[PDB]
Amino acid sequence: TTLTRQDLNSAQVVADVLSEFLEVAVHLILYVREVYPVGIFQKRKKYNVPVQMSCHPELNQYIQDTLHCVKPLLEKNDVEKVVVVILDKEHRPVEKFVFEITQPPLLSINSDSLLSHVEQLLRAFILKISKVDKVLDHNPPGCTFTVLVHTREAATRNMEKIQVIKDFPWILADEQDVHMHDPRLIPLKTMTSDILKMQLYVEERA
């Protein structure tokens, strides 16, 4: 039997770890940028550091449904970027938290110590997000958020405009929900490892 990258147990494990990291990061961004009120969040521990978890069931289910779709894309190494876009009441983008991801074309079948230094890496990103409010101006009241995903274009590109994954429909975002005229770029953290390279930065409206 011939195996593809996604068939590797290691690929599935890393995808699970990274998908959960994105969930923790999204919750934290929503908290520190006050997209949702502080009242719905509760302090919890992840990667041995304090994090903030929404206790609103609807929002939690939405975030899980969204990110569950990214999991298979991660296993196949087709994800290039996952972005959390914060928009004002005028539907204009005010901040964008960009998570760039690269993974090797394969992972070892000798899964021995696959996740040995991964936690320290994820922890560093969470800590940077935790204090990001110190380098950003407060957002206007009434903001909302959208999650954007960029993948690598394969051979037989799918031309379908409404692509469904795990019973969740996705569509192409419009220029309005993304375009920012020469925004301020703020690097947060860039790290590498044998199983992943990730770069997080924020784009802030001028």
């Binding site: 929002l59 939405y62 290039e80 959208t146 995903v149 690598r152 569509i171 993304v178």
Partner: peptide, 22 residues
Amino acid sequence: SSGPWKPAKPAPSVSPGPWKPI
């Protein structure tokens, strides 16, 4: 590259939003 792709379902508000299928 392909994207940016976004969920067709918008993020939920604290209390449910209005009826507007299109």
